[PDB]
Write an enzyme that holds these catalytic residues in place. Structure first.
Site, PDB file in Angstrom:
ATOM      1  N   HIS A 266      -4.321   5.203   4.957  1.00 43.51           N
ATOM      2  CA  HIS A 266      -4.047   6.469   4.265  1.00 43.51           C
ATOM      3  C   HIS A 266      -4.609   6.459   2.845  1.00 43.51           C
ATOM      4  O   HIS A 266      -5.233   7.417   2.427  1.00 43.51           O
ATOM      5  CB  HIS A 266      -2.529   6.729   4.237  1.00 43.51           C
TER       6      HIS A 266
ATOM      7  N   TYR B 114       0.746  -1.244   0.000  1.00 46.25           N
ATOM      8  CA  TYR B 114       0.000   0.000   0.000  1.00 46.25           C
ATOM      9  C   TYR B 114       0.779   1.299   0.000  1.00 46.25           C
ATOM     10  O   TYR B 114       0.235   2.315  -0.409  1.00 46.25           O
ATOM     11  CB  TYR B 114      -0.989   0.010   1.164  1.00 46.25           C
TER      12      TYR B 114
ATOM     13  N   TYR C  97      -7.658   8.936   1.387  1.00 45.46           N
ATOM     14  CA  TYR C  97      -7.640   9.746   0.166  1.00 45.46           C
ATOM     15  C   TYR C  97      -8.820   9.427  -0.721  1.00 45.46           C
ATOM     16  O   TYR C  97      -9.391  10.321  -1.337  1.00 45.46           O
ATOM     17  CB  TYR C  97      -6.368   9.513  -0.635  1.00 45.46           C
TER      18      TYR C  97
ATOM     19  N   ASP D  18      -3.107  12.823   6.051  1.00 42.94           N
ATOM     20  CA  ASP D  18      -1.637  12.895   6.082  1.00 42.94           C
ATOM     21  C   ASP D  18      -1.089  12.845   7.510  1.00 42.94           C
ATOM     22  O   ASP D  18      -0.110  12.131   7.825  1.00 42.94           O
ATOM     23  CB  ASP D  18      -1.148  14.176   5.387  1.00 42.94           C
TER      24      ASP D  18
ATOM     25  N   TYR E  50      -2.800  22.387   1.954  1.00 44.26           N
ATOM     26  CA  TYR E  50      -3.472  22.649   3.201  1.00 44.26           C
ATOM     27  C   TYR E  50      -2.603  23.470   4.127  1.00 44.26           C
ATOM     28  O   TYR E  50      -1.447  23.796   3.820  1.00 44.26           O
ATOM     29  CB  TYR E  50      -3.914  21.344   3.894  1.00 44.26           C
TER      30      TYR E  50
ATOM     31  N   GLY F  50       1.035   0.885  -5.285  1.00 44.64           N
ATOM     32  CA  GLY F  50       0.156  -0.173  -4.816  1.00 44.64           C
ATOM     33  C   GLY F  50      -1.035   0.257  -3.974  1.00 44.64           C
ATOM     34  O   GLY F  50      -0.903   1.067  -3.049  1.00 44.64           O
TER      35      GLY F  50
ATOM     36  N   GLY G 188       2.868   3.940  -1.481  1.00 45.97           N
ATOM     37  CA  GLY G 188       3.460   4.435  -2.727  1.00 45.97           C
ATOM     38  C   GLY G 188       2.721   4.447  -4.052  1.00 45.97           C
ATOM     39  O   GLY G 188       2.386   5.518  -4.581  1.00 45.97           O
TER      40      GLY G 188
HETATM   41 CA   LIG Z   1      -1.171   3.428  -2.511  1.00 49.18          CA
END
Ligand SMILES: [Ca+2]
Lengths: 119, 5
Positions: free
Chosen positions: A47, A27, A51, A93, A67, A31, A29
């Site tokens: 995360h 997950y 998003y 974030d 932000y 992926g 990056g």
């Molecule tokens: Ca990802």
């Protein structure tokens, strides 16, 4: 935005380069599939999902939305002058950066074969 | 699909 997220990581994990988190597990990056391989990967899955939710807001683009936030004296804060999109993305974030700080880093899980292992 | 950290 991604520049700001990088700075959040640098402020909560000054011990490692931000690039270490840019291609990790299933997950972190690119992926976005399969079984999270460890705690750090689970931080990234949350995360990524966060998003996807923010994207439901009209005109809200997590990678690019700037932000308002602060990183000082060991504390990371999303400020009060964020609109709904900025506030959500800032929170995604912020929570990920804190998650990264408490998760073990396994060098074996860096740069794994997404096609073979994240099905 | 772009990046992290
Ligand atoms: Ca990802």
């Amino acid at each position: 935005n991604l520049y700001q997220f990088k700075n959040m990581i640098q402020c909560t994990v000054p011990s490692r380069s931000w690039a270490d988190f840019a291609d990790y597990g299933c997950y972190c990056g690119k992926g976005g599939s399969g079984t999270p391989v460890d705690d750090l990967d689970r931080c990234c899955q949350t995360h990524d999902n966060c998003y996807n939710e923010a994207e439901n807001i009209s005109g809200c683009r997590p990678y690019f939305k700037t932000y308002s936030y602060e990183c000082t004296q060991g504390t990371l804060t999303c400020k009060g002058d964020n609109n709904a999109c900025a506030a959500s993305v800032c929170d995604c974030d912020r929570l990920a950066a804190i998650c990264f700080a408490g998760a073990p880093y396994n060098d074996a899980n860096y740069n794994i074969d997404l096609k073979a292992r994240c099905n | 699909v772009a990046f992290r950290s």
